[PDB]
Amino acid sequence: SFRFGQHLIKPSVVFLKTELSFALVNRKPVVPGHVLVCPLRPVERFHDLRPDEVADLFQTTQRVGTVVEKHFHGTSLTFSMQDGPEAGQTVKHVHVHVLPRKAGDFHFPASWRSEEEMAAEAAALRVYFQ
Amino acid sequence: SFRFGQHLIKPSVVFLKTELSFALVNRKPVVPGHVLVCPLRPVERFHDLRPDEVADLFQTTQRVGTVVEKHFHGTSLTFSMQDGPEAGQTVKHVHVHVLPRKAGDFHFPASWRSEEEMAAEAAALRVYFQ
Ligand SMILES: OC[C@H]1O[C@](O)(CO)[C@@H](O)[C@@H]1O
Ligand SMILES: OC[C@H]1O[C@](O)(CO)[C@@H](O)[C@@H]1O
Secondary structure, X not given: XXXXXXXXXXXXXXXXXXXXXXEEEOOOOOOOOOEEEEEOOOOOOHHHOOHHHHXXXXXXXXXXXXXXXXXXXXXXXXXXXEEOOOOOOOOOOOOEEEEEEOOOOOOOOOOOOOHHHHHHHHHHHHHHHO | OEEEXXXXXXXXXXXXXXXXXXXXXXXXXOOOOOEEEEEOOOOOOHHHOOHHHHHHHHHHHHHHHHHHHHHOOOOEEEEEEEEOOOOOOOOOOOOEEEEEEOOOXXXXXXXXXXXXXXXXXXXXXXHHHO
């Protein structure tokens, strides 16, 4: 129901939606609580966003960071946007990576989990935005 | 004339100032064109910023990124905010690192340069915001 590049994201893994942005959980989060915040409009580069979308994207990112930091017990946050092919972008849609951090944390297999586990995680996250 | 944690930044190295933010060049940029965008108000964590400051911080960051990417000839940009002690924050002031990226780029000595070279670089950057 949500667009993220050329794949549709099921609303079950989406925990926040604003007039212009949405936040979703990852299939293979690099650290517990690694989430993404993206503009609803699928643009490829950061410069394509309107001032409206830029503000909303980052106000949402601030709200999400506070929540994931709280829920996954981090003491800091790393926010990062890989803007472009040479930056590391894989999917052509601007998005911010929000990763809760903690001391000593360091930063289809791996961190992989089921869709249901993602939906469970997203449901726990929706509680903080009620 | 500008505050960045507990040190004053000379206006000569500052290339953009808005009602709520400013952008400055680095002493030891990690890649050519690595600049910083920070809120004028010296806050320690991202969550301390008001919605006002959040929007402004990131609208400015979008403008700066477009410029540094143009000037230093990058084809992408990496934006990053180390929010907190466990994230890597060194100076207690929220700020975004804007780093122009290009193919094969990889990502008091080193990249070190004089204050005058920093002032020269900032002056070249001010031209794009005229
Ligand atoms: O995923 C983070 C969540 O998992 C726990 O460690 C297990 O319930 C919680 O205290 C926290 O809220
Ligand atoms: O620092 C980037 C600048 O330096 C040059 O390589 C040397 O003048 C330019 O073309 C560019 O504008």
